[PDB]
């Protein structure tokens, strides 16, 4: 019999994902101990490839760890689900990169390229053409990753990006003194030029979209951060004084561990940009609902943490009672999630044996 899907059970599933997105080995252990994923390599492999809320960066960091038997067994199950038969190396890399971001720490990238290349070779025994050194496959696979990053980097300016002859020249003599066939490198370059090797989006992609629309607020897309709710509220400087109904309009972005307050900067036909005003940590935050003669859907946020005493952070009035309920319910839940995360992070007492 399975455990029902209540609010607390869903919260600890999210806690498991949060822990994975900060320290992958801890998150996997947490999800296994709670019964959310079987304690097998195949179970974790299918979990990592199918479940939302997992950072593509952190999936790569877990799978790229060659120092633990479990992680290596999971990566074996991962690549064994992929078919690279009768396709070119870059075409197989495109399929691999769609699920796993092949970027990060060098030792993790090497391990990911190693398992990829080994699977590509087992999938293509019918290709009678071979390099003089079999290890040349690993080199070309690296070169494809680096070209894709170079060609579609917003940090390398166009005039200095790698051109066709630059890609070819850099690989000169790499196959035991001789070069890889020119026609092969030309075909790889052209296919990459036509379509960037993109990884499937995750929750971090959503935060990056919001980030670019906010002008400082601009750097929010940490691997564990997830957008929960976008809500329009009206700021209330003084709840004991009236104000016009549409005044102090704010566009609020609630994340799983952070509350961001903005105001519209520019509104065109459809596009919109925002000006960052302030952000608040959810730890020790309390949510109060109020109503008086001036505001029927009031919200008051306080910082009931230690140090000093209770402090008022900000007041709002929602446009209607349903918006206040939905926003405050999600904020309260995220606050509860963070407090459990802080209790778990206090585990570092375990680290100090």
XYZ file of C-alpha atoms in Angstrom:
353
model
C 0.000 0.000 0.000
C 1.262 3.410 -1.030
C 1.375 6.550 1.049
C -1.353 9.042 0.196
C -0.468 12.367 -1.405
C -1.178 14.876 1.316
C 0.303 18.271 1.943
C 3.097 17.008 4.256
C 3.997 14.133 1.934
C 4.201 16.491 -1.029
C 6.344 18.882 1.075
C 8.943 16.237 1.892
C 9.059 15.210 -1.803
C 9.962 18.841 -2.595
C 12.492 18.831 0.264
C 14.114 15.774 -1.382
C 14.345 17.599 -4.695
C 15.738 20.715 -2.956
C 18.438 18.594 -1.284
C 19.288 16.957 -4.631
C 19.664 20.367 -6.270
C 22.109 21.432 -3.532
C 23.940 18.088 -2.850
C 22.853 15.288 -5.204
C 24.001 12.339 -3.094
C 22.075 13.662 -0.061
C 18.933 14.239 -2.120
C 18.968 10.721 -3.617
C 19.425 9.248 -0.122
C 16.574 11.371 1.193
C 14.220 10.355 -1.633
C 15.115 6.672 -1.198
C 14.667 6.697 2.585
C 11.219 8.275 2.129
C 10.035 5.718 -0.429
C 9.793 8.148 -3.370
C 12.234 6.157 -5.494
C 13.402 2.537 -5.372
C 16.824 1.763 -3.907
C 18.145 0.493 -7.229
C 20.283 2.039 -9.983
C 17.536 1.505 -12.585
C 14.982 3.122 -10.312
C 17.128 6.213 -9.796
C 18.050 6.369 -13.483
C 14.386 6.469 -14.525
C 13.670 8.972 -11.749
C 16.414 11.352 -12.904
C 15.337 11.253 -16.554
C 11.573 11.605 -16.006
C 10.892 13.757 -12.940
C 10.437 17.490 -12.946
C 12.063 19.709 -10.362
C 15.560 18.289 -10.856
C 18.295 20.630 -12.052
C 19.951 19.460 -15.277
C 23.245 20.752 -13.845
C 22.900 18.626 -10.722
C 21.820 15.514 -12.645
C 25.129 15.851 -14.508
C 27.053 16.301 -11.251
C 25.500 13.125 -9.828
C 25.985 11.021 -12.984
C 29.476 12.399 -13.605
C 30.717 11.182 -10.198
C 33.054 8.255 -10.890
C 33.992 7.810 -7.226
C 30.846 5.990 -6.085
C 29.702 2.618 -7.392
C 26.028 3.567 -7.188
C 26.437 6.664 -9.314
C 28.385 4.709 -11.972
C 25.706 2.014 -12.021
C 22.999 4.666 -12.439
C 24.872 6.241 -15.399
C 25.127 2.799 -16.986
C 21.342 2.431 -16.706
C 20.958 5.934 -18.142
C 22.954 5.389 -21.343
C 21.543 1.907 -21.819
C 18.146 3.595 -22.402
C 19.557 5.543 -25.347
C 19.806 4.424 -28.980
C 22.654 5.951 -30.978
C 22.651 3.433 -33.823
C 23.356 4.573 -37.393
C 23.804 8.226 -36.526
C 26.725 10.626 -36.563
C 28.590 11.441 -33.362
C 27.085 14.917 -33.036
C 23.589 13.580 -33.679
C 24.054 11.070 -30.829
C 25.462 13.832 -28.600
C 22.333 15.879 -29.342
C 20.159 13.081 -27.985
C 22.430 12.678 -24.914
C 22.604 16.415 -24.205
C 18.821 16.769 -24.442
C 18.565 15.029 -21.053
C 21.959 15.671 -19.506
C 23.756 18.976 -19.503
C 27.303 18.130 -20.482
C 28.840 21.090 -18.733
C 30.321 21.688 -15.304
C 33.366 20.444 -13.433
C 36.009 18.953 -15.696
C 36.203 15.528 -14.068
C 32.416 15.192 -14.235
C 32.366 16.251 -17.930
C 35.037 13.687 -18.764
C 33.106 10.897 -17.080
C 29.889 11.858 -18.860
C 31.720 11.966 -22.242
C 33.351 8.616 -21.466
C 30.029 6.803 -20.835
C 28.458 8.530 -23.815
C 31.289 7.530 -26.160
C 31.329 3.924 -24.952
C 27.552 3.666 -25.596
C 27.983 5.234 -29.057
C 30.576 2.660 -29.955
C 28.483 -0.305 -28.725
C 25.593 1.098 -30.767
C 27.690 1.361 -33.952
C 29.658 -1.844 -34.710
C 28.410 -1.592 -38.329
C 30.522 1.515 -38.972
C 33.583 -0.033 -40.591
C 35.457 3.257 -40.752
C 37.560 3.759 -37.651
C 40.275 6.004 -36.351
C 43.799 4.705 -35.780
C 43.421 5.310 -32.097
C 40.029 4.288 -30.702
C 40.393 6.972 -28.037
C 39.942 9.586 -30.794
C 36.193 9.230 -30.307
C 36.442 10.812 -26.865
C 38.474 13.737 -28.319
C 36.022 14.511 -31.098
C 33.061 14.252 -28.676
C 34.782 16.885 -26.483
C 35.447 19.071 -29.495
C 31.780 18.954 -30.452
C 30.737 20.104 -26.973
C 33.247 22.922 -26.979
C 32.223 24.064 -30.498
C 28.540 24.126 -29.527
C 29.314 26.159 -26.424
C 31.585 28.502 -28.380
C 29.166 29.013 -31.268
C 26.168 29.792 -29.063
C 27.889 31.541 -26.171
C 26.587 35.021 -25.343
C 30.067 35.682 -23.753
C 32.187 35.058 -26.945
C 31.595 37.796 -29.410
C 30.878 36.821 -33.004
C 34.111 37.923 -34.632
C 36.173 35.738 -32.294
C 33.905 32.677 -32.349
C 35.312 29.547 -33.984
C 34.926 29.453 -37.746
C 34.897 26.300 -39.913
C 38.612 26.353 -40.631
C 39.339 27.175 -36.992
C 37.395 24.075 -35.861
C 39.302 21.976 -38.382
C 42.729 23.465 -37.603
C 42.343 22.914 -33.860
C 41.885 19.164 -34.426
C 45.001 18.789 -36.635
C 46.970 15.612 -36.115
C 44.893 14.399 -33.212
C 44.385 10.818 -34.434
C 47.858 9.380 -33.738
C 49.499 12.148 -35.735
C 47.000 12.437 -38.572
C 43.781 14.349 -38.720
C 40.200 13.252 -38.675
C 38.676 13.197 -42.185
C 37.892 16.753 -43.338
C 34.458 15.831 -44.645
C 33.467 14.492 -41.229
C 34.422 17.701 -39.412
C 32.683 19.798 -42.066
C 29.453 17.860 -41.597
C 29.629 18.198 -37.804
C 30.207 21.969 -37.987
C 27.299 22.509 -40.412
C 24.789 20.518 -38.325
C 25.773 22.464 -35.186
C 25.541 25.740 -37.112
C 22.004 24.797 -38.137
C 20.797 23.795 -34.670
C 22.324 24.353 -31.252
C 22.648 21.345 -28.988
C 20.045 22.305 -26.404
C 19.234 20.609 -23.128
C 15.595 20.174 -22.208
C 14.383 22.938 -19.972
C 14.008 22.606 -16.241
C 12.765 24.833 -13.400
C 16.004 26.797 -13.569
C 15.163 27.785 -17.151
C 11.935 29.369 -15.853
C 13.801 31.420 -13.271
C 16.327 32.526 -15.906
C 13.409 33.861 -17.980
C 12.157 35.929 -15.040
C 15.741 37.097 -14.235
C 16.202 38.650 -17.661
C 12.977 40.641 -17.327
C 14.039 42.227 -14.012
C 16.423 45.180 -13.968
C 18.243 45.596 -10.656
C 16.891 40.785 -8.715
C 18.934 39.934 -11.837
C 20.634 36.779 -10.452
C 18.051 34.413 -8.993
C 18.548 31.163 -10.945
C 20.370 29.062 -8.396
C 20.016 25.304 -9.071
C 17.520 24.716 -6.258
C 15.329 27.806 -6.807
C 11.895 27.287 -8.261
C 9.195 29.789 -9.179
C 6.019 29.097 -7.248
C 3.639 31.941 -7.998
C 3.375 35.192 -9.850
C 0.850 37.561 -8.236
C -0.174 41.178 -8.553
C -0.679 42.986 -5.274
C -0.907 46.587 -4.119
C 1.585 47.793 -1.515
C 0.165 49.529 1.512
C 2.579 51.895 3.267
C 0.119 52.556 6.114
C -2.789 50.190 6.746
C -4.448 52.855 8.943
C -4.742 55.344 6.045
C -6.737 55.060 2.820
C -5.316 55.051 -0.662
C -6.612 54.847 -4.224
C -7.563 51.359 -5.369
C -4.904 50.993 -8.048
C -2.008 52.654 -6.212
C 1.448 51.080 -5.545
C 0.951 48.187 -7.927
C 3.496 45.437 -7.493
C 4.335 42.311 -9.437
C 5.320 39.640 -6.937
C 7.445 36.628 -7.709
C 7.296 33.956 -5.031
C 10.031 31.371 -5.191
C 10.376 28.290 -3.022
C 12.861 30.108 -0.755
C 12.514 33.783 -1.643
C 9.887 36.503 -2.125
C 10.708 39.144 -4.734
C 8.827 42.429 -5.043
C 8.918 44.384 -8.288
C 7.086 47.107 -10.178
C 6.460 47.252 -13.888
C 9.158 49.267 -15.677
C 8.058 49.170 -19.316
C 4.893 47.655 -20.850
C 4.823 47.398 -24.613
C 2.319 45.566 -26.846
C 2.850 42.338 -24.902
C 6.367 42.270 -23.473
C 6.975 43.662 -20.023
C 9.992 44.434 -17.868
C 10.208 44.970 -14.136
C 12.168 47.064 -11.692
C 13.509 45.249 -8.660
C 12.401 46.788 -5.398
C 13.150 44.309 -2.619
C 13.440 40.647 -1.676
C 12.745 38.778 1.516
C 14.002 35.483 2.861
C 11.263 33.150 3.989
C 13.041 31.949 7.165
C 11.217 33.263 10.188
C 8.641 35.063 8.088
C 5.051 35.130 9.291
C 1.976 35.924 7.280
C -0.867 37.924 8.723
C -4.208 38.606 7.089
C -6.057 41.796 7.988
C -9.078 43.797 6.998
C -10.264 47.207 8.078
C -12.398 50.054 6.719
C -9.786 50.871 4.081
C -8.513 47.437 2.944
C -10.710 44.325 2.614
C -7.912 41.962 1.472
C -4.932 43.033 3.522
C -1.739 41.040 3.932
C 1.007 41.828 6.449
C 4.384 40.098 6.456
C 6.562 40.083 9.546
C 10.008 38.816 10.490
C 9.387 37.013 13.772
C 12.963 35.808 14.023
C 15.332 36.108 16.995
C 17.921 38.864 17.605
C 15.529 41.742 18.021
C 11.762 41.289 18.377
C 8.903 41.129 15.855
C 9.464 43.378 12.828
C 7.100 44.409 10.058
C 8.416 43.772 6.559
C 5.651 44.950 4.203
C 1.885 45.286 3.818
C -0.280 44.563 0.791
C -3.895 44.598 -0.311
C -4.957 41.980 -2.835
C -7.386 42.809 -5.657
C -9.896 40.223 -4.384
C -10.267 37.642 -1.597
C -9.375 34.671 -3.805
C -6.012 36.186 -4.744
C -5.222 36.803 -1.054
C -6.096 33.217 -0.123
C -4.113 31.627 -2.929
C -1.036 33.813 -2.428
C -0.991 33.468 1.361
C -1.537 29.722 1.203
C 1.426 29.262 -1.163
C 3.608 31.643 0.849
C 2.789 29.831 4.082
C 3.654 26.499 2.505
C 6.972 27.753 1.155
C 7.768 29.173 4.612
C 7.044 25.753 6.128
C 9.259 24.111 3.488
C 12.179 26.435 4.258
C 11.939 25.837 7.986
C 12.258 22.083 7.375
C 15.177 22.734 5.059
C 16.898 24.725 7.834
C 16.295 21.916 10.328
C 17.882 19.508 7.814
C 20.825 21.821 7.071
C 21.458 21.884 10.833
C 22.554 18.285 10.175
C 26.091 19.630 9.753
C 26.336 18.768 13.449
C 26.546 15.214 12.083
C 29.514 16.330 9.920
C 31.370 17.449 13.021
C 31.218 13.720 13.872
